[PDB]
Amino acid sequence: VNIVDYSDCFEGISGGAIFCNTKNKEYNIYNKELIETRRSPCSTFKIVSTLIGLEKGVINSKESVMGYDGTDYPNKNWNKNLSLEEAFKESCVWYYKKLINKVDAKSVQNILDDLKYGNCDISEWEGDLKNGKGHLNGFWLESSLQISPKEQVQTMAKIFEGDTNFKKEHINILRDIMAIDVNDANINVYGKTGTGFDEKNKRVDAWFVGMLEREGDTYYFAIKSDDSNKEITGPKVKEIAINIIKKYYS
Numbered sequence: 639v640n641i642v643d644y645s646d647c648f649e650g651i652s653g654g655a656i657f658c659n660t661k662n663k664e665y666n667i668y669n670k671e672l673i674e675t676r677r678s679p680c681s682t683f684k685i686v687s688t689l690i691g692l693e694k695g696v697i698n699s700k701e702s703v704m705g706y707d708g709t710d711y712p713n714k715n716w717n718k719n720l721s722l723e724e725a726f727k728e729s730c731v732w733y734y735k736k737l738i739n740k741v742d743a744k745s746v747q748n749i750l751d752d753l754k755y756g757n758c759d760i761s762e763w764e765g766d767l768k769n770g771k772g773h774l775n776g777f778w779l780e781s782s783l784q785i786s787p788k789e790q791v792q793t794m795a796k797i798f799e800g801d802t803n804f805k806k807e808h809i810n811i812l813r814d815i816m817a818i819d820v821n822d823a824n825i826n827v828y829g830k831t832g833t834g835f836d837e838k839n840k841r842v843d844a845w846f847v848g849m850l851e852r853e854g855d856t857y858y859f860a861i862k863s864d865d866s867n868k869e870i871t872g873p874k875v876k877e878i879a880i881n882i883i884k885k886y887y888s
């Protein structure tokens with residue numbers, strides 16, 4: 639366990655980072671206090687909800703559809719019968735809400751328990767209804783479910799090293815749709831952003847969680863901001879993560 643200083647890459651934004659190589663057990667941590675603090679996963683939960691949907695047969699492949707009903711949304715890409723791959727990349731809320739609401743709560747509780755997914759608290763299934771967004775809410779979006787960045791890394795490692803009961807076929811679908819292009823062919827990066835605002839504490843929850851493969855070595859990582867500036871989003875924290883990867887993990 640090495641404490642490290644990645645502040646240069648955060649460019650003034652408050653946050654922390656954790657990278658873990660489970661082969662040679664090297665855990666690199668920037669802002670240990672924050673890395674151990676549980677927060678809403680926001681859209682990073684789509685990593686797990688995709689696997690839940692595959693395991694329960696709600697969806698079956700990166701092509702699978704959820705039966706778009708014509709509802710109007712501001713994001714143009716949400717207004718179509720999009721595939722799993724496109725819903726994941728567009729972070730399409732209605733698709734993932736419809737997917738999870740086809741799964742019984744006890745099945746979800748038991749999967750989160752098995753994964754040790756933070757507090758595993760799905761008690762507020764419908765999410766943070768006081769924000770007015772109605773059915774565009776759920777337990778994973780600034781609601782009852784909370785997970786620390788370290789726990790995110792621990793969960794990703796267990797999934798992608800083959801240490802859960804999820805089917806290998808389903809893990810590979812997830813890997814496929816999580817892959818990102820960082821304009822460096824010598825590292826494979828996979829991840830998912832998340833964005834929320836913690837109304838209680840007046841701070842963002844901005845995430846980028848995933849893994850890095852570079853010649854035999856694999857690093858599981860979570861980068862997290864808790865800045866008070868509402869302009870700090872998941873996508874911005876993903877840029878910070880990419881800078882860290884290129885600087886220190888190339």
Ligand SMILES: *C(=O)N1C[C@H](NOS(=O)(=O)O)CC[C@H]1C(N)=O
Pocket residue numbers: 680681682728729731779830831832833834871872873
């Ligand atoms: C998930 O965090 N969300 C869904 C969507 N995409 O977020 S992302 O760009 O950080 O990946 C919009 C923000 C957020 C939400 N409000 O539901």
